[PDB]
Coordinates of C-alpha atoms in Angstrom, one line a residue:
Chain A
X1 CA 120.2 -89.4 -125.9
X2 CA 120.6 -93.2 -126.2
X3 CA 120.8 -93.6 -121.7
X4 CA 118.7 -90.3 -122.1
X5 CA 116.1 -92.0 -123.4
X6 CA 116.5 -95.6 -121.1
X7 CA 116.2 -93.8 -118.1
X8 CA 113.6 -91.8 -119.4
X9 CA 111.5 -94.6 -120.4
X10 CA 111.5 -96.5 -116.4
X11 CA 110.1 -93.0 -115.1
X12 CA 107.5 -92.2 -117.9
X13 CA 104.2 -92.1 -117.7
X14 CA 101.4 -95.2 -117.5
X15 CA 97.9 -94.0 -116.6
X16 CA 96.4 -96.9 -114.3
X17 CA 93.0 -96.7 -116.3
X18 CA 90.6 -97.1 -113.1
X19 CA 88.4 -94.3 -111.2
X20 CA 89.8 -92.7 -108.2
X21 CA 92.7 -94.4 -108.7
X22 CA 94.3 -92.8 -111.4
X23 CA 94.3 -89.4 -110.0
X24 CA 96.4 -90.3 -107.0
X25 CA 98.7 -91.4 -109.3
X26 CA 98.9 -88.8 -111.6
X27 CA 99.7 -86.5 -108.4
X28 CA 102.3 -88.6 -107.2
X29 CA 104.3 -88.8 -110.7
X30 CA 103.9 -85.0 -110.7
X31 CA 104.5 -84.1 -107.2
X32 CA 106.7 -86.7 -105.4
X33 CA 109.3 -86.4 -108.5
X34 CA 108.7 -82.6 -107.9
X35 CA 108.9 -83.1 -104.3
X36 CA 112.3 -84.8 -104.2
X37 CA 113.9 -82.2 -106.6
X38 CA 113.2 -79.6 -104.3
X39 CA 114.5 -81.3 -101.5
X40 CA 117.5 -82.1 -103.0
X41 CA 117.8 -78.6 -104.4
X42 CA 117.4 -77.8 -100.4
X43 CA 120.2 -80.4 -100.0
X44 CA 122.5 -79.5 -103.1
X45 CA 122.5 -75.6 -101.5
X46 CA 125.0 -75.3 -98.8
X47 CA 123.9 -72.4 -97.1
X48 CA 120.9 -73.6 -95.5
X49 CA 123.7 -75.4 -93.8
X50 CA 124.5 -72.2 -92.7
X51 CA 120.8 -71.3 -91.7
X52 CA 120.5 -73.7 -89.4
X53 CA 123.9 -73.6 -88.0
X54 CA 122.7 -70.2 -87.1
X55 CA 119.6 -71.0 -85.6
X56 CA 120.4 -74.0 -83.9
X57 CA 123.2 -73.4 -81.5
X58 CA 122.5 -69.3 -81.2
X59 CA 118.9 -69.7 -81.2
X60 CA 119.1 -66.3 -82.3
X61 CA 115.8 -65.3 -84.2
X62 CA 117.5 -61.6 -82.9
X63 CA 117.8 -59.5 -85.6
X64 CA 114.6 -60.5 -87.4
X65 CA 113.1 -63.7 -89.4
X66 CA 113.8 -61.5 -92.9
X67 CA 117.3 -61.6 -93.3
X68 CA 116.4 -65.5 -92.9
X69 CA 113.8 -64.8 -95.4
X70 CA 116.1 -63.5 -97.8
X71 CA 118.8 -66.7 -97.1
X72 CA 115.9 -68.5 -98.4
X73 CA 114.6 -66.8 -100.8
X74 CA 118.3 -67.1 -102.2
X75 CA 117.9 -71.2 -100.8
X76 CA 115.2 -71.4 -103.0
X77 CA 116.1 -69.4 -106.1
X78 CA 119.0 -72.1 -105.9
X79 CA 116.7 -74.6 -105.2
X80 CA 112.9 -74.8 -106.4
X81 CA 113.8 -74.4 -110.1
X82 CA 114.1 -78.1 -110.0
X83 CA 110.3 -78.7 -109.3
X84 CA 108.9 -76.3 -111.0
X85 CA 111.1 -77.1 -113.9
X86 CA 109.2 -80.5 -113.8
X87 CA 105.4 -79.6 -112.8
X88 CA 105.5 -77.2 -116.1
X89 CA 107.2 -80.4 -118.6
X90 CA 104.6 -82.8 -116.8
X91 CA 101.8 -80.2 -117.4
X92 CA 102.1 -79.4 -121.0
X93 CA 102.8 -83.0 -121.9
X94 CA 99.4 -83.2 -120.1
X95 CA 99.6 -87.3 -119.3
X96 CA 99.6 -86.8 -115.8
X97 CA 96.4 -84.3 -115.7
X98 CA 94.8 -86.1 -118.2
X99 CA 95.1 -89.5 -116.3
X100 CA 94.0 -87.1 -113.4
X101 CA 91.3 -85.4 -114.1
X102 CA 89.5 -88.3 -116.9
X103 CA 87.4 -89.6 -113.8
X104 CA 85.4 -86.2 -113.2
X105 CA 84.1 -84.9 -116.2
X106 CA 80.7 -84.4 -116.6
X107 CA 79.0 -87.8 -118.2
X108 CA 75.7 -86.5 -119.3
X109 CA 76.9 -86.6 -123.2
X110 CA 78.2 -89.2 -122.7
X111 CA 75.1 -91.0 -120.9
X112 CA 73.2 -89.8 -124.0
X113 CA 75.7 -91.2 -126.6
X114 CA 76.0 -94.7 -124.6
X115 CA 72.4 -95.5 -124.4
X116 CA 71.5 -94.3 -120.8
X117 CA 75.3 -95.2 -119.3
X118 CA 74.8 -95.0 -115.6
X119 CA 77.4 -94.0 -113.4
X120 CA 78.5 -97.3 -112.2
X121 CA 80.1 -97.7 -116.1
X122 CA 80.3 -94.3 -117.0
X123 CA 82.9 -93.4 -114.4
X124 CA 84.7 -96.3 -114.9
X125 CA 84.2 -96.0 -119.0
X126 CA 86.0 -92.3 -118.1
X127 CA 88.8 -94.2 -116.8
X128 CA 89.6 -95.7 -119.4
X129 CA 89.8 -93.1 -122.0
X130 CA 93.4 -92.4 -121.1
X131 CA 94.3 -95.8 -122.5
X132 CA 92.4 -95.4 -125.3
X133 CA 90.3 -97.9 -124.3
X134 CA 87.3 -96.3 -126.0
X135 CA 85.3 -98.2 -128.8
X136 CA 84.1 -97.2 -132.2
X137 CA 80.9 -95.6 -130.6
X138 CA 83.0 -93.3 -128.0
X139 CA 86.4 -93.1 -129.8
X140 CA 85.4 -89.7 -131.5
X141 CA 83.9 -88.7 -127.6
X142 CA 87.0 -89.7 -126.2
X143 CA 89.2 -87.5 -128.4
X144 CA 87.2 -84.5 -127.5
X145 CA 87.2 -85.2 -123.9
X146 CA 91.1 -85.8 -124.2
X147 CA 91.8 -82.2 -126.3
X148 CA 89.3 -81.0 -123.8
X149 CA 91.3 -81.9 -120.9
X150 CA 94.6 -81.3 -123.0
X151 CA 93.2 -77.6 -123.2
X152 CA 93.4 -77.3 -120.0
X153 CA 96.8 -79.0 -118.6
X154 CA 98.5 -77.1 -121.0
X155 CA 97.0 -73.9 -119.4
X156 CA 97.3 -74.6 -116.4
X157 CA 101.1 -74.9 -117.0
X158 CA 101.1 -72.1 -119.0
X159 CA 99.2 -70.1 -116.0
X160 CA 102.1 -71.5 -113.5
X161 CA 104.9 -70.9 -115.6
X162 CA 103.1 -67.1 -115.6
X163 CA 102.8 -66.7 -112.5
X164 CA 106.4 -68.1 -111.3
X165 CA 107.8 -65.2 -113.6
X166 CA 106.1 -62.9 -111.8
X167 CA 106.7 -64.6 -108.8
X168 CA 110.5 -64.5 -109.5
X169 CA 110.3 -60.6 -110.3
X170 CA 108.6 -59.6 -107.7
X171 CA 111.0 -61.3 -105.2
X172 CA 113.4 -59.3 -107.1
X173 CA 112.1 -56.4 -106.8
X174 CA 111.7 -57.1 -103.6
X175 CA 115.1 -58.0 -102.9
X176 CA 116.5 -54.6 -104.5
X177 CA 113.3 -52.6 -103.4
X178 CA 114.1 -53.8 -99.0
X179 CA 118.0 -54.0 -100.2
X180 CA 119.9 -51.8 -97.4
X181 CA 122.6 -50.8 -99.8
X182 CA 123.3 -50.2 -103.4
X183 CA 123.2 -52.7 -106.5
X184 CA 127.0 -52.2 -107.2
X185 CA 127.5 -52.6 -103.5
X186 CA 125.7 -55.5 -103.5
X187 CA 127.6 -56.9 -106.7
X188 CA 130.8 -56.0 -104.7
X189 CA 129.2 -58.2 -101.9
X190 CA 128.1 -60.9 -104.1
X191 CA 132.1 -60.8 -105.3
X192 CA 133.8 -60.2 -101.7
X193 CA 131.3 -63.7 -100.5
X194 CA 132.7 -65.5 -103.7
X195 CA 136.2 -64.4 -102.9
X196 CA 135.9 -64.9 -99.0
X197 CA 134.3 -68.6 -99.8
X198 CA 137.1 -69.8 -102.7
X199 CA 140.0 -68.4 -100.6
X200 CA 138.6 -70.3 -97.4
X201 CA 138.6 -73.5 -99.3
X202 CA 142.0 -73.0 -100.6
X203 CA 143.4 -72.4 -97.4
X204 CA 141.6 -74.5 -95.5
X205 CA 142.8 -77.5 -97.5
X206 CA 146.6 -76.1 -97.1
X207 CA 146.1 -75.1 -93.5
X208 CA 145.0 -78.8 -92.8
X209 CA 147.4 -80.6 -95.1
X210 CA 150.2 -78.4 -93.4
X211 CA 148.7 -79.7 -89.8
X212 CA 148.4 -83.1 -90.8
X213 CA 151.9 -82.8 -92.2
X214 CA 153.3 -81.9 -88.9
X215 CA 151.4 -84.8 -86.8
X216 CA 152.8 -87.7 -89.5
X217 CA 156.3 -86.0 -89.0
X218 CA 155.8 -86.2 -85.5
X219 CA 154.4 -90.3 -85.6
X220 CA 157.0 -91.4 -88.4
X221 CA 160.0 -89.2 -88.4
X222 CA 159.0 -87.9 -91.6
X223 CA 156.4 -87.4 -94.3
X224 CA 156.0 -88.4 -98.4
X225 CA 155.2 -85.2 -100.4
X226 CA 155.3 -84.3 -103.7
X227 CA 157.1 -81.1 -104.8
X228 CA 153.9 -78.8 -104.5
X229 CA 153.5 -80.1 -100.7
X230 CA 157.5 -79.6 -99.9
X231 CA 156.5 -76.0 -100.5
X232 CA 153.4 -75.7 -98.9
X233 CA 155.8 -76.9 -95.8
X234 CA 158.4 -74.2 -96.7
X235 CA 156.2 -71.6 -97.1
X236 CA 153.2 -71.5 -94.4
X237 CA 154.2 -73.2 -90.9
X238 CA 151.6 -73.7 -88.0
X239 CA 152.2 -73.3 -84.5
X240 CA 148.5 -73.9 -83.7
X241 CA 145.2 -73.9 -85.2
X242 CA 142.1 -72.0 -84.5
X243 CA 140.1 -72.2 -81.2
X244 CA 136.2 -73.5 -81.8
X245 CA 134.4 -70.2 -80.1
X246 CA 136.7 -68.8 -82.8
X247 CA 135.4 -70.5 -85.3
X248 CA 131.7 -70.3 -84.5
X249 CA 132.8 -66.2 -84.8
X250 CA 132.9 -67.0 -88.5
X251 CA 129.6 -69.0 -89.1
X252 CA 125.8 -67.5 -89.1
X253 CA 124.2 -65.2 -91.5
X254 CA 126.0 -63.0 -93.5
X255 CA 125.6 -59.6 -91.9
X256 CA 125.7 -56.1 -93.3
X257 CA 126.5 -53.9 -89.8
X258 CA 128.7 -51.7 -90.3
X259 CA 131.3 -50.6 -87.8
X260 CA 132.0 -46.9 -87.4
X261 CA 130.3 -46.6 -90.8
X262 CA 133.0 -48.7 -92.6
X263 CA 130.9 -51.7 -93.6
X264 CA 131.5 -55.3 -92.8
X265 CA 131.0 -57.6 -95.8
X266 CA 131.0 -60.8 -93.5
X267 CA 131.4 -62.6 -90.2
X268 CA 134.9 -62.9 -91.0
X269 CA 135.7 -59.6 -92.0
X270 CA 133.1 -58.7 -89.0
X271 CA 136.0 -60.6 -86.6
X272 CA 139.0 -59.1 -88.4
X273 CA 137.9 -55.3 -88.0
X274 CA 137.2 -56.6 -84.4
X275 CA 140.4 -57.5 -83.8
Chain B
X1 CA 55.1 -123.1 -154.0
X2 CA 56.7 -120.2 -155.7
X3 CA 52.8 -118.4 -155.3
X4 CA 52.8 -120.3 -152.1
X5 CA 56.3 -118.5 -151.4
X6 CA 55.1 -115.2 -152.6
X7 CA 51.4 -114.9 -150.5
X8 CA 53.7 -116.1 -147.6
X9 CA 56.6 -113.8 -147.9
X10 CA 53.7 -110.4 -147.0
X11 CA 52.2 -112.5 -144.2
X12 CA 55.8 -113.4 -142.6
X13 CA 56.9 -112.4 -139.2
X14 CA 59.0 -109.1 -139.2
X15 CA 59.5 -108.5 -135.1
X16 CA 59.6 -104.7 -134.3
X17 CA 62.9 -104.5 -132.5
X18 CA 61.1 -102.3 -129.5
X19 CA 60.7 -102.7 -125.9
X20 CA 56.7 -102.8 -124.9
X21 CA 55.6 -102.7 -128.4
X22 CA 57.2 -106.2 -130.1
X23 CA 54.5 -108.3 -127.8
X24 CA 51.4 -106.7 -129.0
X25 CA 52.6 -106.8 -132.4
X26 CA 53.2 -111.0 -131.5
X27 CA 50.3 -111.3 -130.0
X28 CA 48.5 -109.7 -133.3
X29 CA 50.2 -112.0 -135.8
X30 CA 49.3 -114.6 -133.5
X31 CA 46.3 -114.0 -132.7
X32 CA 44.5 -112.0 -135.6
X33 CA 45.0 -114.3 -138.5
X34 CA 43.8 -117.2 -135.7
X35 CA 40.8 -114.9 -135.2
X36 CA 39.9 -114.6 -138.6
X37 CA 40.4 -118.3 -139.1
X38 CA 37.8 -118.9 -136.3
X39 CA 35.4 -117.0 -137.6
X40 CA 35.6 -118.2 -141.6
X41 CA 35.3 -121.4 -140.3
X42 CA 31.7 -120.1 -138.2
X43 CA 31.2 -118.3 -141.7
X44 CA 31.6 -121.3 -144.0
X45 CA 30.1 -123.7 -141.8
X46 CA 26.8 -124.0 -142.9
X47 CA 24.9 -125.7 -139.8
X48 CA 25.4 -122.2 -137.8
X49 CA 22.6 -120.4 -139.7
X50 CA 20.4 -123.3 -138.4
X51 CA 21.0 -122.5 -135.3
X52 CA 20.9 -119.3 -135.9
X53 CA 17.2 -119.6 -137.7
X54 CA 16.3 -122.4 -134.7
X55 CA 16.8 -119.4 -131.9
X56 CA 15.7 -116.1 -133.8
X57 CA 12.1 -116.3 -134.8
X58 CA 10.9 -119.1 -132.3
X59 CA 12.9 -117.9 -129.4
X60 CA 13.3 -121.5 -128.3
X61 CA 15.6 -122.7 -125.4
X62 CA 13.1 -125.3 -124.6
X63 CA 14.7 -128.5 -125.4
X64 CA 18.1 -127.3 -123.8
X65 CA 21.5 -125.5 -124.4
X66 CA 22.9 -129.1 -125.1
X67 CA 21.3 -130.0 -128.4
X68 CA 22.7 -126.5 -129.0
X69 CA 25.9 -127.1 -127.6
X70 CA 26.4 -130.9 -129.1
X71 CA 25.4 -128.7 -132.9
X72 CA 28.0 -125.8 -131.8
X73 CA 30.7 -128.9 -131.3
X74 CA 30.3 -129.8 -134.5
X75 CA 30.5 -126.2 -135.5
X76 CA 33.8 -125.9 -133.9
X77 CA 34.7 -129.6 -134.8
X78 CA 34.3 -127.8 -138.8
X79 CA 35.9 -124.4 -137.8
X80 CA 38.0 -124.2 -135.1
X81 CA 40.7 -126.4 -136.7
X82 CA 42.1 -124.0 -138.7
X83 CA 42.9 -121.3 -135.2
X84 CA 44.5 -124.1 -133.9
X85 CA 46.6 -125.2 -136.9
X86 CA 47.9 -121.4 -137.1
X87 CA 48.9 -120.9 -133.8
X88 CA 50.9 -124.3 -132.9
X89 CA 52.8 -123.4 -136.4
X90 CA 53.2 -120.0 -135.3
X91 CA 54.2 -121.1 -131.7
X92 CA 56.5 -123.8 -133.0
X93 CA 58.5 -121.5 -135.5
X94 CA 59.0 -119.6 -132.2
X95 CA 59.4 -116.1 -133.8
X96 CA 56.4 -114.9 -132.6
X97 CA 57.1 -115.9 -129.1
X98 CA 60.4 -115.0 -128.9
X99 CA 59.2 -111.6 -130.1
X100 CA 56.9 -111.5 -127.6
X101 CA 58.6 -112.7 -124.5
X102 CA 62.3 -110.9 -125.7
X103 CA 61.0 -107.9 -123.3
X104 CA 60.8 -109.8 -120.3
X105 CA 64.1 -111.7 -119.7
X106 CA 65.8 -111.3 -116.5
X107 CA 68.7 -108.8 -117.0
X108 CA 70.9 -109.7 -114.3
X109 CA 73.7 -111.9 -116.1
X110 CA 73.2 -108.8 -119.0
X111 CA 74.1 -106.8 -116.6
X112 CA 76.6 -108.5 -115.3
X113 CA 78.4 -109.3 -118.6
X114 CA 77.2 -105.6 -120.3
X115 CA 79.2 -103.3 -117.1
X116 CA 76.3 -103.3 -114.7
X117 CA 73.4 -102.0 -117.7
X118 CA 70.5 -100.1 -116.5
X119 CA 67.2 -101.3 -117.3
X120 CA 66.1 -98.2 -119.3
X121 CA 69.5 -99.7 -121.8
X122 CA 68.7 -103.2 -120.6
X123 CA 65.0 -103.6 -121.9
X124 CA 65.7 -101.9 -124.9
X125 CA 68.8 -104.4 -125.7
X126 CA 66.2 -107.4 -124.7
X127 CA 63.8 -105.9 -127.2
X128 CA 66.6 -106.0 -130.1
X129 CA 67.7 -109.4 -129.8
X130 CA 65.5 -111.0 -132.2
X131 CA 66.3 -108.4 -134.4
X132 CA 70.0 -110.4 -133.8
X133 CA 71.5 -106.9 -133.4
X134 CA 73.5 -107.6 -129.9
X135 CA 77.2 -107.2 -130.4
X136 CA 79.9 -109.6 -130.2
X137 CA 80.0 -108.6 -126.7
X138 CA 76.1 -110.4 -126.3
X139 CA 76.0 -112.5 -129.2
X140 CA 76.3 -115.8 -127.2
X141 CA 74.1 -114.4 -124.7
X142 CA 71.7 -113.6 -127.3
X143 CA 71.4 -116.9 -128.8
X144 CA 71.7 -118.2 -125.3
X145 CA 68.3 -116.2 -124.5
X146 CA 67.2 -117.3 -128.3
X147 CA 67.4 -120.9 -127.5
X148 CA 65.8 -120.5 -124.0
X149 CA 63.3 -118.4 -125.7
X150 CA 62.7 -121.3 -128.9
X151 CA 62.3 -123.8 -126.1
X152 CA 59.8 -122.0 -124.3
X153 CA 57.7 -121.1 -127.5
X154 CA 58.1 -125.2 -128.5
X155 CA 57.2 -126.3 -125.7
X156 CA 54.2 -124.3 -125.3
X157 CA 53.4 -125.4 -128.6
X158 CA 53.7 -129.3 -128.1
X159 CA 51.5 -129.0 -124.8
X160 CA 48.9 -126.7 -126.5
X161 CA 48.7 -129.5 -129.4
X162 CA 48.5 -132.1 -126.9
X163 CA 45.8 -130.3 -124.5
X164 CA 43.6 -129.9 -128.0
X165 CA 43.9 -133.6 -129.0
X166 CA 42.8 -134.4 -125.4
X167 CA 40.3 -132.0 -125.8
X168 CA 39.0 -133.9 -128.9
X169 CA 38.9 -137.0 -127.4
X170 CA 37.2 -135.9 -124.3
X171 CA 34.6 -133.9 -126.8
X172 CA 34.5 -137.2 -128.8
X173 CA 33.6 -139.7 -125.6
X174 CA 31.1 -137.0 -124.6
X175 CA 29.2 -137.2 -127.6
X176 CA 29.0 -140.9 -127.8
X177 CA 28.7 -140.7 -124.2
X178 CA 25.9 -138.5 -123.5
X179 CA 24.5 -140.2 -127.2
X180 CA 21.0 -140.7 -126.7
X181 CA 21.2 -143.8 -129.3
X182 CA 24.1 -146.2 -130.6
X183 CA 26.9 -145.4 -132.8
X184 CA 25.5 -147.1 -136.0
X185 CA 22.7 -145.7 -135.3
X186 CA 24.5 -142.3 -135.8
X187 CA 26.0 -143.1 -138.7
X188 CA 22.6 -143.9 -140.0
X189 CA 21.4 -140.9 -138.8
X190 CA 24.2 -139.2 -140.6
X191 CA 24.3 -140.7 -143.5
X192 CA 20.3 -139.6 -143.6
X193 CA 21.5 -136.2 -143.3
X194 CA 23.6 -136.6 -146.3
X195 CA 21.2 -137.8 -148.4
X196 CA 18.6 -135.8 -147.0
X197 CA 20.6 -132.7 -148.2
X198 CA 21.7 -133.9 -151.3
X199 CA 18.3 -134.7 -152.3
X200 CA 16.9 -131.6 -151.0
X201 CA 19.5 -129.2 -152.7
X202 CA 18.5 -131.4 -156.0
X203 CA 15.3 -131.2 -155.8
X204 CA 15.0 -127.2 -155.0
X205 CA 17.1 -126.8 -158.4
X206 CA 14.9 -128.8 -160.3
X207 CA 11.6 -127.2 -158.7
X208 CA 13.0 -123.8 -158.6
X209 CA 13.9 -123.9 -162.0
X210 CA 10.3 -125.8 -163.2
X211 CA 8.5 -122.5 -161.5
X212 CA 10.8 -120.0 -163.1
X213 CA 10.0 -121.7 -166.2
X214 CA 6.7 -121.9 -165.7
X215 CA 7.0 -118.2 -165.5
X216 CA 8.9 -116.9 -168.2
X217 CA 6.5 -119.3 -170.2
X218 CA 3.6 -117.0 -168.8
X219 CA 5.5 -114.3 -170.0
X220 CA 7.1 -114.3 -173.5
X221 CA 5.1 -117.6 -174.5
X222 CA 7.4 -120.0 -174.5
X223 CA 10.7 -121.1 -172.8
X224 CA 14.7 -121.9 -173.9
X225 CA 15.7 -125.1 -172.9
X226 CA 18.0 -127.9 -173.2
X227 CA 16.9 -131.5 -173.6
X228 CA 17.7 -131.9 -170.0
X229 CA 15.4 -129.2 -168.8
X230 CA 12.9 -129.8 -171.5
X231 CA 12.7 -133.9 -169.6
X232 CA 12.2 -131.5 -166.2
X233 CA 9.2 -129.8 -167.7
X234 CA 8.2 -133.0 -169.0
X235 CA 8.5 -135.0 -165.7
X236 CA 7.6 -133.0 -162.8
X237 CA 4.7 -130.0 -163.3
X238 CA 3.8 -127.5 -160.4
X239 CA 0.6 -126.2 -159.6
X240 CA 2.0 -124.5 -156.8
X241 CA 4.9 -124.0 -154.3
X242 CA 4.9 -124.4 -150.5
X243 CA 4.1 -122.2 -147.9
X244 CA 6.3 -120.1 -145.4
X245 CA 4.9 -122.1 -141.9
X246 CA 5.3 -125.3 -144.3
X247 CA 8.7 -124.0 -144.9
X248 CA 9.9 -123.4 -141.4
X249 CA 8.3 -126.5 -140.4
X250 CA 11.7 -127.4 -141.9
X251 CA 14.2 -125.7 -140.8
X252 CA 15.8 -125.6 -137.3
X253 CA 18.1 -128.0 -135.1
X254 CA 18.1 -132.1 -136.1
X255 CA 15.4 -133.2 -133.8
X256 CA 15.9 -136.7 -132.2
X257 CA 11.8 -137.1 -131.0
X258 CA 10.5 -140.7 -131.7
X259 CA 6.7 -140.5 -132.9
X260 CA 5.1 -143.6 -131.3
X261 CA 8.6 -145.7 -131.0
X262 CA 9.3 -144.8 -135.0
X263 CA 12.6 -142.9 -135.3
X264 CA 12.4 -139.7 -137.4
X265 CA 15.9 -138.3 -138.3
X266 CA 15.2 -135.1 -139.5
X267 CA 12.4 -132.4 -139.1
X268 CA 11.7 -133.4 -142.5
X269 CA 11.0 -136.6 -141.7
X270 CA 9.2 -135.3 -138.5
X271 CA 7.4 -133.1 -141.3
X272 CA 6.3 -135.9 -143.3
X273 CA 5.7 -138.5 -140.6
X274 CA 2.9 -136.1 -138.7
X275 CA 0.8 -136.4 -142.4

């Protein structure tokens, strides 16, 4: 509320009141804010990690470019709610449209009011409306040109916030209308990945504390562990750990073959059945 | 004064705050009351219906157009003072001027100072400036272009009043200068002409009113008189009056011929000197 409200205050809005001026910057506080929170949403996701660990050392484009299509449709269902989260706040606050789109309206009422205003100080007198800037003879003009233009940020936000919901059901429906399997199947799936993903973590932390363990044994003569570690030793030694064609088994796309009609949930489980 | 206030308040500049329309209406005021001044002082000069009776029935050029023009300089010298004492206080008051010339300023520092003004706005601005309704915005620029405007309305009035009192010195060296007799010698001459009309206007009373008595007298049987006209009877009878070529014997332009070296001042005197 209270650092809400200081950090908000550095990144609001202040319309540069100059012609073709102030629209450049009314696209750049809506779209480079927009910009870096959907490439940060690309960054925050991990499995476009796994995209182009696919496609980089496999250069496998193999089975097709739509189970990559559905990776990022899932990439960016993680990932551009973030700028369209803020195009739609920026647009129905309307600052950023107004201070765009103040220096193209149509002066001709506003050449009659001002006494034959030429263009020369009409455009620049349309400039400065977002500020306010307007006198006594223009201040009831420029509150009509300002609900005008008001009218229609707010529906153009209310158009793209439309047409995103659509947007989003129609991916999902498209998701469960190309889906190769069931929806319980694929909730199963979406379960079995969760599970795969946590266990992974949790064992790859103790398979690599357990390794590390062993090579400070074998510098010092022994190693400092608390009680949880002393059994993490008892419990799960290592020989040896994985070879790296082994592990690049694991990584890629999650695939859906299915061998001898048993189905294979992922690379992992694709390399245990194989073995 | 408070009459002199109230006959001058309807006659008193009110400039038409309008582009191509505030200089003719300067140029009336101006003008127009100069114009009628002019020609009251032709209508209350007397000496113009001499000359007007010296060139309608005889038709006479003969002398020259110089005795004509020296009489029409002294018809001016009567009349045309009071054109001249209108418009040097009209041009030195200014308002007429600056009503005039207000339309025709250079707009460029206007246009600098008023967001680059178009001339359809800027003339029409000129035109209501001495109508003192420029904004705050133009308010020192107005009494900038006021002052400039004063000084060029003053100005022309000082050398307007200077080019007329050279103008009546140069008419006044003329006259003694192409003077076809000395300078007391004029003032004889004019002082003749006084008395000449004095006498004359006296005298036509007095024998007018001793034929219209004569008359009535030959109408009811009698006449009603005062003392005073009862000593007119008494004093100077008529058998009868004088005849129209006696009469315009009279009249026309103050001959300056000399009968055999003798002077005669008047035609008159001409009149009488040939009997």
């Amino acid at each position: 509320t209270v650092g809400s409200q200081e950090l908000f205050s550095v990144v609001a809005f202040h319309c540069p009141c100059s012609p073709a001026r102030n629209y450049l910057y009314g696209l750049a506080a809506i779209g480079v804010p927009a910009l870096v929170l959907f490439i940060i949403g690309i960054i925050l996701n991990n499995h476009t990690w796994n995209l182009v660990a696919e496609c980089q050392h496999r250069r496998t484009k193999n089975c097709s470019a739509a189970p990559t299509f559905l990776l990022l449709s899932s990439i960016l269902g993680r990932a551009a709610v973030a700028p369209v989260t803020w195009s739609v706040i920026s647009l129905l606050r309307g600052e950023a449209y107004v201070c765009a789109l103040s220096e193209f309206v149509d002066p001709s009422s506003l050449t009659a009011r001002e006494e034959h205003f030429p263009s020369a100080h009409a455009t620049e007198i349309l400039a400065r409306f977002p500020c306010k800037e307007n006198p006594d003879n223009l201040s009831d003009f420029r509150e009509e040109v300002s609900r005008r233009l008001r009218y229609e940020s707010q529906l153009f936000g209310w158009l793209l916030i439309g047409v995103v919901a659509i947007l989003v059901f129609l991916t999902k429906c498209l998701k469960h209308y190309c889906s190769p399997l069931s929806y319980r199947q694929e909730a199963y799936w979406a379960q079995y990945r969760a599970n795969e993903d946590q266990l992974f973590q949790r064992t790859a932390e103790v398979h690599s504390r357990v390794l590390a363990a062993n090579n400070v044994r074998r510098f010092f003569g022994f190693v400092a562990l608390n009680k949880d570690d002393e059994e993490l030793i008892a419990n799960f030694p290592v020989e040896g750990t994985q070879p790296r064609p082994q592990w690049n088994a694991i990584t890629g796309v999650y695939l859906y073959r299915e061998n001898q009609g048993l189905p294979l949930y992922s690379r992992l489980h694709k390399w245990a059945q194989g073995l």
